[PDB]
Structure formats: C-alpha cells, structure tokens
Amino acid sequence: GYSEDRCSWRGSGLTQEPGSVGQLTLDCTEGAIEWLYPAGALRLTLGRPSIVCLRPERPFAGAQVFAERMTGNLELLLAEGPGGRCMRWGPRERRALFLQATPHRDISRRVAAFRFELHED
C-alpha cells in the first residue's frame, strides 16, 4: 500500500475488480511507485506549469507509463525493453499518470518500479 508518509506506493497486480483502473493519489513532489506482478491498470494522480520526470529502477518490466493530457491523448514516458523520461503539463492540466500492465505470455515475476519528481518550471 501507501508508505508511511503517503508519498510512495507498493502493491501487486491483484489490485481490484478486473477491468477497473485502480486509483492512486500522491500529493508529494517526490516519491516512488513499485508495481509488483503488474496486472490491469492503475491511474496515479499527482497532487503554473509543471514538469514531471520519471526514473525507472532497472530492470523495468511488466508495464508502460503514460501521461494523461487534457486532450485525452497519452504520451509514453516509460516502456519495457531498452534512465529518465520527462514531460510537461499545462497550468490547468490534471497531473495524472496511467500505468498499464503489458501483456506477458508468462505469469512470472516482473516489477515495474520508478521514482517521480515534480518541478515548477
């Protein structure tokens, strides 16, 4: 679950009703996500223009991380296979990441873990 200070989260793919996107809210400027055996999808809301940077912990596998734009469009920040991806949200954009488990042929141990940092550019 959430860490002691609620700036980080660490859970397993068996999060909730299959098909529903689980909901995470983190109101800090710096934190970490550890998604063990990713399954399904998660939406992480991160509570002037803002810049977000993600730093994966290698090996990173089992999921992709997208940034939700006001357009409803998505921007891939972190993906599986072959250090840092940044992106900028507008002043009025909801700061939301979408974590989507990748379809693995095997059900084995994969961990999608990353750190995030928010900057007021």
Curated annotation (Swiss-Prot):
Induction: By all-trans retinoic acid (ATRA). Highly expressed in brain. Expressed in undifferentiated neural progenitors and in astrocyte lineage, particularly in Bergmann glia, a subtype of radial glia, and a few discrete neuronal populations residing in the superior colliculus, the ocular motor nucleus, the raphe and pontine nuclei, and in various thalamic nuclei. Weakly expressed in heart, kidney, skeletal muscle, spleen, testis, gut and lung. It is found in: Secreted. It comes from the Eukaryota. Disulfide bonds join C7-C28, C53-C86. Belongs to the meteorin family. Involved in both glial cell differentiation and axonal network formation during neurogenesis. Promotes astrocyte differentiation and transforms cerebellar astrocytes into radial glia. Also induces axonal extension in small and intermediate neurons of sensory ganglia by activating nearby satellite glia. Monomer. Was called meteorin because it can transform glial cells into cells with an elongated trail. This is Meteorin. It comes from Mus musculus. The chain holds residues 22 to 151 of 291 of the full protein.
